[PDB]
Design a protein around this ligand. Structure first.
Ligand SMILES: [Cl-]
Ligand SMILES: [Cl-]
Ligand SMILES: [Cl-]
Ligand SMILES: [Cl-]
Ligand SMILES: [K+]
Ligand code: NA
Length: 274
């Protein structure tokens, strides 16, 4: 898998990124990570899509195999960083797919790149409603330099949802181990600011200048109340759809990769018929 790992200079910063350079018909699949983890979250999903698609996975600033402290930024910078990589690689049309709060990047990426470049988007397991007390409390903890690690552990609890999932545990306890408070504090502040200023992902997506097909595929929250906001938003908006995947954890890219692929392929094939 470290064949496709590349590094390049983006404005000030050196950013690492996956690229299989696969020469084939568009669109590119742009796999966007969330906060405080990297391309490794997508290693099983990359396997599913490798042969048939060109797959690109940009790591954010201070994210990668060797995490490093960097000056503050947010999702607007993540967008620019992603587009700069897309230019350097000479990629035109792409299908973005986000994990959790990489969705803020995805929904602003849709806005700036526009529907001819990015005609559709898949968001994975991303809390559609404005923060409930439990999650709100987590972000509070995350921002606190005294309790940030206690904060991440509270998330790992929720995310694993009482499951001894071998692969997702490896991601959280080994592949996210190196990420310190510079990331986690930053993610807390940006995410909280993202809800407050855009209201919610649903608000943000509905407020697009050019609305277009988006699908929300998720495995949690598992409650009937959460499906309902998803189906109510679906009723109300022709372009919105969703799929409940019934996988164990917060990371469908890892534990039900075959299923995540199936919805990406559907969208890719839909784009390929203009
Ligand atoms: Cl995230
Ligand atoms: Cl919640
Ligand atoms: Cl969070
Ligand atoms: Cl389309
Ligand atoms: K719909
Ligand atoms: Na567990």
């Amino acid at each position: 898998t470290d064949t496709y790992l590349h590094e390049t200079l983006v404005f000030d910063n050196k950013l690492s990124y996956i690229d299989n350079q696969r020469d084939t018909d568009g669109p590119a699949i742009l796999l966007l990570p969330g906060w405080c983890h990297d391309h490794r979250v997508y290693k099983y999903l990359i396997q599913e899509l490798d042969a048939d698609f060109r797959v690109i996975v940009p790591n954010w600033r201070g994210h990668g195999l060797s995490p490093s402290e960097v000056p503050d930024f947010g999702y607007q910078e993540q967008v620019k960083d992603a587009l700069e990589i897309l230019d350097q690689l000479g990629v035109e049309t792409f299908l973005p797919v986000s994990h959790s709060h990489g969705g803020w990047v995805l929904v602003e990426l849709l806005e700036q790149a526009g529907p001819e470049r990015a005609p559709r988007g898949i968001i994975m397991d991303w809390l559609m409603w404005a923060p409930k007390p439990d999650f709100a409390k987590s972000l509070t903890l995350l921002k606190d330099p005294e309790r940030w690690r206690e904060g991440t552990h509270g998330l790992f609890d929720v995310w694993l949802d009482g499951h001894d999932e071998k692969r997702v545990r490896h991601h959280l306890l080994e592949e996210m181990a190196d990420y310190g408070y510079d990331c986690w504090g930053r993610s807390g502040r940006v995410i909280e600011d993202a809800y407050g200023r855009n209201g919610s992902p649903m608000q943000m997506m509905a407020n697009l200048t050019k609305t277009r097909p988006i699908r929300h595929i998720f495995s949690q929250p598992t409650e009937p109340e959460y499906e309902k906001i998803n189906s109510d938003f679906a009723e109300q908006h022709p372009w919105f759809s969703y799929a409940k995947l019934g996988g164990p954890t917060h990371f469908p890219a890892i534990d039900v990769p075959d299923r995540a692929a199936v919805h990406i392929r559907e969208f890719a094939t839909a784009i390929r018929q203009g």
